[PDB]
Motif scaffolding. Structure first.
Motif, PDB file in Angstrom:
ATOM      1  N   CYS A 199      -1.457  -2.165  -8.173  1.00  0.00           N
ATOM      2  CA  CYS A 199      -0.639  -2.086  -6.986  1.00  0.00           C
ATOM      3  C   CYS A 199      -1.482  -1.543  -5.832  1.00  0.00           C
ATOM      4  O   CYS A 199      -1.412  -2.042  -4.719  1.00  0.00           O
ATOM      5  CB  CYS A 199       0.579  -1.183  -7.241  1.00  0.00           C
ATOM      6  N   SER A 200      -2.335  -0.573  -6.141  1.00  0.00           N
ATOM      7  CA  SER A 200      -3.179   0.065  -5.148  1.00  0.00           C
ATOM      8  C   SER A 200      -4.204  -0.921  -4.558  1.00  0.00           C
ATOM      9  O   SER A 200      -4.528  -0.856  -3.368  1.00  0.00           O
ATOM     10  CB  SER A 200      -3.896   1.234  -5.789  1.00  0.00           C
ATOM     11  N   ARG A 201      -4.731  -1.812  -5.390  1.00  0.00           N
ATOM     12  CA  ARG A 201      -5.672  -2.805  -4.898  1.00  0.00           C
ATOM     13  C   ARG A 201      -4.953  -3.940  -4.174  1.00  0.00           C
ATOM     14  O   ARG A 201      -5.454  -4.457  -3.166  1.00  0.00           O
ATOM     15  CB  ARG A 201      -6.602  -3.362  -6.002  1.00  0.00           C
ATOM     16  N   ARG A 202      -3.779  -4.313  -4.674  1.00  0.00           N
ATOM     17  CA  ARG A 202      -3.006  -5.398  -4.087  1.00  0.00           C
ATOM     18  C   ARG A 202      -2.366  -4.995  -2.758  1.00  0.00           C
ATOM     19  O   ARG A 202      -2.296  -5.809  -1.816  1.00  0.00           O
ATOM     20  CB  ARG A 202      -1.974  -5.936  -5.091  1.00  0.00           C
ATOM     21  N   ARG A 203      -1.919  -3.769  -2.660  1.00  0.00           N
ATOM     22  CA  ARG A 203      -1.354  -3.291  -1.437  1.00  0.00           C
ATOM     23  C   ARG A 203      -1.917  -1.914  -1.092  1.00  0.00           C
ATOM     24  O   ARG A 203      -1.319  -0.873  -1.387  1.00  0.00           O
ATOM     25  CB  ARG A 203       0.178  -3.280  -1.483  1.00  0.00           C
ATOM     26  N   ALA A 204      -3.083  -1.915  -0.473  1.00  0.00           N
ATOM     27  CA  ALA A 204      -3.767  -0.684  -0.087  1.00  0.00           C
ATOM     28  C   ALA A 204      -3.070  -0.026   1.101  1.00  0.00           C
ATOM     29  O   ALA A 204      -3.332   1.132   1.438  1.00  0.00           O
ATOM     30  CB  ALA A 204      -5.227  -0.971   0.240  1.00  0.00           C
TER      31      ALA A 204
END
Length: 16
Positions: free
Chosen positions: A8-13
């Protein structure tokens, strides 16, 4: 949260 979940962190920084 989203920044506690790598995928999630990489997909929506924007949430971090």
């Amino acid at each position: 949260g989203c920044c506690s979940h790598p995928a999630c962190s990489r997909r929506r920084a924007r949430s971090c």
